[PDB]
């Protein structure tokens, strides 16, 4: 809720887009297709903000 600091947080994913919605649409479709044997979940971070 601080407009001054928001761009710095959005870049580092402390508060902003969720991992499923800032990756390229190709990557997120790729990741869920192969999650059975090769997981790309713990790498990209998803923010949570109170």
């Amino acid at each position: 809720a601080t407009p001054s600091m928001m761009p710095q947080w959005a870049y580092m994913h402390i508060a902003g887009q969720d991992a499923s919605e800032y990756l390229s649409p190709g990557l997120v479709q790729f990741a869920r297709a192969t999650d059975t044997y090769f997981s790309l979940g713990n790498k990209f971070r998803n923010p949570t903000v109170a």
Binding site: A19, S20, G26, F30, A31, R32, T36, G41, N46, P47
Partner: peptide, 27 residues
């Protein structure tokens, strides 16, 4: 396009479940 890499639980691939969930901290 990328669904050809997914196991087929029948005729529909097991792709889905959007839980690219990556967040944990002491919190």
């Amino acid at each position: 396009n990328f669904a050809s890499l997914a196991p087929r639980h029948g005729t529909r691939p097991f792709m889905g479940t959007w839980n690219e969930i990556g967040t944990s901290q002491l919190n």
